[PDB]
Amino acid sequence: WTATSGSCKGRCFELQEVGPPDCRCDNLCKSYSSCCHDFDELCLKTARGWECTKDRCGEVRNEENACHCSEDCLSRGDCCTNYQVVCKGESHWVDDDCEEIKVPECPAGFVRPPLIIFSVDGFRASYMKKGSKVMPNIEKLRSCGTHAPYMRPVYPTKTFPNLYTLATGLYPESHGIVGNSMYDPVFDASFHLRGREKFNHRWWGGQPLWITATKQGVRAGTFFWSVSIPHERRILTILQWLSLPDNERPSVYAFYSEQPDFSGHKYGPFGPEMTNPLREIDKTVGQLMDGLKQLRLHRCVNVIFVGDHGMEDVTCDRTEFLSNYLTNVDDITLVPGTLGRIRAKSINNSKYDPKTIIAALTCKKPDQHFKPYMKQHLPKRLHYANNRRIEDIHLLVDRRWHVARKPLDVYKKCFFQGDHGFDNKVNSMQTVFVGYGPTFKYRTKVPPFENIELYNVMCDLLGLKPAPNNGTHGSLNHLLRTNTFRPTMPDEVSRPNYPGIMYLQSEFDLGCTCDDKVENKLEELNKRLHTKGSTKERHLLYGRPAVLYRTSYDILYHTDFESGYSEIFLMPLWTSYTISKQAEVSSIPEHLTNCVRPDVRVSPGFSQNCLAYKNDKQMSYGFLFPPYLSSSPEAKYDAFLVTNMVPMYPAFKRVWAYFQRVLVKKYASERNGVNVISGPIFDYNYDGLRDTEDEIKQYVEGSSIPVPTHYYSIITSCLDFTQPADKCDGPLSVSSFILPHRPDNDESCNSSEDESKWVEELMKMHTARVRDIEHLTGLDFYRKTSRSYSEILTLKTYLHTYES
Numbered sequence: 001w002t003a004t005s006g007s008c009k010g011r012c013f014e015l016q017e018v019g020p021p022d023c024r025c026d027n028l029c030k031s032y033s034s035c036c037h038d039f040d041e042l043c044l045k046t047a048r049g050w051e052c053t054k055d056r057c058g059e060v061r062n063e064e065n066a067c068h069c070s071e072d073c074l075s076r077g078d079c080c081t082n083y084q085v086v087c088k089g090e091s092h093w094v095d096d097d098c099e100e101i102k103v104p105e106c107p108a109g110f111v112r113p114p115l116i117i118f119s120v121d122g123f124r125a126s127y128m129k130k131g132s133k134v135m136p137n138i139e140k141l142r143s144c145g146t147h148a149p150y151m152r153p154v155y156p157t158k159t160f161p162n163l164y165t166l167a168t169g170l171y172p173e174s175h176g177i178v179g180n181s182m183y184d185p186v187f188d189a190s191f192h193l194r195g196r197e198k199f200n201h202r203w204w205g206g207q208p209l210w211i212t213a214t215k216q217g218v219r220a221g222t223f224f225w226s227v228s229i230p231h232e233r234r235i236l237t238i239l240q241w242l243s244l245p246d247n248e249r250p251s252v253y254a255f256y257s258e259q260p261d262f263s264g265h266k267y268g269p270f271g272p273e274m275t276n277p278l279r280e281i282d283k284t285v286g287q288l289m290d291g292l293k294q295l296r297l298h299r300c301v302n303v304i305f306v307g308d309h310g311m312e313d314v315t316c317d318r319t320e321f322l323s324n325y326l327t328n329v330d331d332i333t334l335v336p337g338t339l340g341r342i343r344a345k346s347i348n349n350s351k352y353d354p355k356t357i358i359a360a361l362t363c364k365k366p367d368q369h370f371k372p373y374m375k376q377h378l379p380k381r382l383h384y385a386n387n388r389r390i391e392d393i394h395l396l397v398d399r400r401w402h403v404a405r406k407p408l409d410v411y412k413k414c415f416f417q418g419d420h421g422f423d424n425k426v427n428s429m430q431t432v433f434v435g436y437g438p439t440f441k442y443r444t445k446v447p448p449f450e451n452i453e454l455y456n457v458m459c460d461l462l463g464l465k466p467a468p469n470n471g472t473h474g475s476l477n478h479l480l481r482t483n484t485f486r487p488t489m490p491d492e493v494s495r496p497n498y499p500g501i502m503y504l505q506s507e508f509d510l511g512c513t514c515d516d517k518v519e520n521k522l523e524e525l526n527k528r529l530h531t532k533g534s535t536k537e538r539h540l541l542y543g544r545p546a547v548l549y550r551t552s553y554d555i556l557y558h559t560d561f562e563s564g565y566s567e568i569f570l571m572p573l574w575t576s577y578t579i580s581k582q583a584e585v586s587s588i589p590e591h592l593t594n595c596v597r598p599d600v601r602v603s604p605g606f607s608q609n610c611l612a613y614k615n616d617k618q619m620s621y622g623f624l625f626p627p628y629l630s631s632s633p634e635a636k637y638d639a640f641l642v643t644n645m646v647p648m649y650p651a652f653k654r655v656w657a658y659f660q661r662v663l664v665k666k667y668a669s670e671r672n673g674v675n676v677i678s679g680p681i682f683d684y685n686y687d688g689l690r691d692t693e694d695e696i697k698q699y700v701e702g703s704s705i706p707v708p709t710h711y712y713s714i715i716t717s718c719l720d721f722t723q724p725a726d727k728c729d730g731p732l733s734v735s736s737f738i739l740p741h742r743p744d745n746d747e748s749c750n751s752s753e754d755e756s757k758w759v760e761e762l763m764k765m766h767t768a769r770v771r772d773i774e775h776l777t778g779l780d781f782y783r784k785t786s787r788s789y790s791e792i793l794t795l796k797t798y799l800h801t802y803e804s
């Protein structure tokens with residue numbers, strides 16, 4: 001109940017929201033149907049429009065007008081944004097040449113530059129170039145401030161997940177807004193864009209910027225605007241708040257625009273009708289900047305222009321229907337569209353089985369336009385599994401497509417020409433970032449980055465301590481003139497052992513064999529030196545990874561590779577090796593095909609054994625350092641050590657062997673040498689974080705050998721490819737992957753063909769940031785380079801996307 005009989009007199013767009021049943025005058029009161037009776041009259045004035053004209057200049061104040069052109073308007077803070085231009089001979093902000101803002105130039109009583117976030121729904125990254133002729137204010141922000149060619153949204157590339165990620169620095173799985181529609185089985189409640197459930201606080205996890213600010217004594221403008229409040233009024237309200245006395249004035253503000261998304265759905269991302277919404281958004285930016293200029297704040301405020309996601313061409317005719325695949329379509333609930341999420345229609349139906357649904361959805365049609373996944377098998381880069389609101393079955397839909405349950409859903413709910421929600425690496429889903437103001441750099445282009453990074457920077461801009469989040473704080477220091485955050489590298493928690501030769505061959509009873517019984521003082525000292533680390537400079541190029549948790553492990557040196565061998569997991573945590581452009585690929589010789597050799601540096605008790613693999617009919621093994629890339633016939637024996645062996649399903653061995661035999665040498669040829677670090681990952685509870693021992697769900701049959709859920713590789717070379725990877729003077733270049741360790745290749749519909757037709761496609765889908773691997777392994781890479789630590793943090797958040 002609302003007692004809408006109070007009044008909004010002197011309360012229009014009040015900051016503190018009052019409690020029911022007292023009526024509200026805040027910018028969201030319309031959304032709650034709780035505004036006081038006179039809210040429209042007093043707070044939503046429209047009379048005479050939004051612009052001064054010549055005849056209005058110096059007018060007598062009429063309180064009824066939307067904005068003012070009287071002499072008193074400046075001290076009242078409520079002039080039309082073009083007042084000084086029309087009436088005082090001033091220029092529009094956009095017509096002024098840009099001049100570097102070297103220091104904040106702020107009016108007295110301003111304690112810090114205010115931050116204004118100007119957020120635009122559905123603003124596709126390529127609109128910055130393609131619409132630049134019709135967006136002169138935005139183009140000035142872009143060219144004069146700091147910009148990225150695009151900013152990567154989070155998956156799913158929907159509005160609510162991305163807006164809340166922007167505000168929190170969190171992945172959707174952590175902040176809890178995992179879709180625009182959700183069902184939470186614990187609450188037994190549904191979240192929808194329409195309706196009241198979405199205002200319940202229990203949906204919204206983490207800590208958004210406006211709460212971080214308030215908790216630390218920084219006043220925030222309300223970030224949200226009821227849809228019926230026109231943009232011009234949103235701007236005037238922000239400019240009015242900026243005129244408040246110092247003790248009442250917010251330091252952070254947000255504007256939100258439902259455009260160009262609204263029109264993009266109707267017309268497609270580049271429909272001819274899209275020009276007008278882009279002009280309109282530019283005009284709104286113009287009003288803000290002219291308004292700031294009138295307040296003498298245009299060289300004081302940091303302005304962020306940022307989108308939530310892009311927009312793709314999608315029409316009704318490009319819809320896959322689950323009724324064309326499933327016998328039992330009425331026994332499931334689908335959350336449809338540009339991603340699919342499936343669960344049981346009834347929790348009472350015990351005939352429901354996700355395995356038979358996945359199978360019925362797998363490679364059934366030649367050009368099938370979605371792919372089914374159990375959520376834990378989705379590419380780890382999406383970070384889209386660790387939440388009870390994310391259904392176990394997920395459909396990754398091809399760009400330009402929809403999935404629906406039955407045809408009647410699509411013509412009983414063609415209209416639209418645009419949509420979004422797809423995989424966040426899809427080019428059409430990329431969005432925009434521009435920062436302009438004293439704290440941002442001048443005329444600086446920065447590489448693309450992920451929106452999860454911005455919360456930290458917005459906290460930096462406001463002098464706030466960020467709540468714990470998924471950004472990597474310092475990775476965006478290159479955007480900033482000042483307020484940089486200078487982190488220290490984490491401290492190593494476990495130091496390695498460096499074992500020498502401690503065991504005789506006969507102490508091992510591993511059931512392994514190797515034909516290595518075939519035989520020099522020149523060359524004997526040489527191989528001893530290799531075991532002591534004499535080639536380590538070649539193969540460990542950026543220092544050894546640091547282990548950031550408590551464990552027992554050994555550094556093992558070899559001619560061709562170095563490893564950190566875990567006594568607890570019976571395998572390396574990491575294996576590091578460098579392959580020059582000149583390296584040659586060889587085969588596994590016949591007499592060594594089934595060779596596994598005891599490692600006399602590591603006890604039988606801390607070793608794998610071959611008998612376990614013999615007995616486990618499902619499980620085979622592979623090697624982390626590939627025997628194919630041995631530097632010599634004699635060094636090749638090192639590659640068959642039991643301490644280089646890892647458990648691998650035969651289906652996975654197809655992928656791995658092609659990566660090792662063919663792809664590594666290809667990358668070395670193309671990149672002028674590569675350094676490779678490979679290893680296992682164990683993430684049985686799909687939380688994106690390293691499992692402890694007691695979380696491991698699967699072992700090689702009969703043994704204590706844990707089975708990895710994933711295998712990673714980090715592939716580093718010189719950004720200047722005229723220099724070899726191992727003699728690089730400047731910035732690095734990296735690509736990485738986290739490949740799912742699966743007992744079939746059902747994910748790859750073409751896997752019956754030669755690995756040259758499907759393996760690299762699989763690896764591209766599972767591309768990763770070094771930072772993703774760090775979370776999953778508890779390791780910290782690149783500890784010893786010549787490079788600045790912030791530069792290294794940027795490198796660690798890099799994602800190689802393979803979008804051309």
Ligand SMILES: *[C@@H]1O[C@H](CO)[C@@H](O[C@@H]2O[C@H](CO)[C@@H](O[C@@H]3O[C@H](CO[C@H]4O[C@H](CO)[C@@H](O)[C@H](O[C@H]5O[C@H](CO)[C@@H](O)[C@H](O)[C@@H]5O[C@H]5O[C@H](CO)[C@@H](O)[C@H](O)[C@@H]5O)[C@@H]4O)[C@@H](O)[C@H](O[C@H]4O[C@H](CO)[C@@H](O)[C@H](O)[C@@H]4O[C@H]4O[C@H](CO)[C@@H](O)[C@H](O)[C@@H]4O)[C@@H]3O)[C@H](O)[C@H]2NC(C)=O)[C@H](O)[C@H]1NC(C)=O
Nearest residue numbers: 173174175176204205206386387388468469470687688775
């Ligand atoms: C991305 O960044 C984020 C933020 O840094 C990372 O997430 C953090 O990860 C931590 C480890 O997983 C986690 O720490 C845990 O905190 C538990 C208490 O958490 C509550 O309080 C905090 C602080 O206010 C709050 O943020 C939490 O909010 C979550 O839950 C609410 C309500 O459910 C949601 O609204 C909200 O969205 C959020 O949900 C997300 O996180 C939870 C996990 O907390 C998930 O389950 C959800 O799916 C969702 O993703 C909470 O309100 C605390 O209980 C934990 O302690 C256990 O483990 C420790 C290890 O130190 C152990 O010593 C303890 O004994 C304890 O175990 C006991 O409980 C077990 C489980 O019930 C039980 O089995 C045992 O027997 C024990 O009794 C733990 O310390 C932190 O909460 C989250 N934070 C957030 C915001 O998500 C994330 O990891 C990053 N991602 C990547 C890939 O790097």
Ligand SMILES: NC(=O)c1ccc(N2CCCC2)c(/C=C/c2ccc(OC(F)(F)F)cc2)c1
Nearest residue numbers: 117119160163164166167223224225226254256
């Ligand atoms: N109609 C609206 O006004 C409306 C409605 C729903 C909104 N969200 C949906 C999920 C969370 C809130 C927002 C978003 C506000 C917002 C503005 C700027 C932002 O970028 C940042 F964080 F960088 F500041 C982040 C969030 C605005």
Ligand SMILES: [Ca+2]
Nearest residue numbers: 121122159308
């Ligand atoms: Ca949106």
Ligand SMILES: [Ca+2]
Nearest residue numbers: 683689690691
């Ligand atoms: Ca885990």
Ligand code: NA
Nearest residue numbers: 613616619620
């Ligand atoms: Na086997």
Ligand code: NA
Nearest residue numbers: 745746748751
């Ligand atoms: Na297949």
Ligand SMILES: [Zn+2]
Nearest residue numbers: 122159261265
């Ligand atoms: Zn949309």
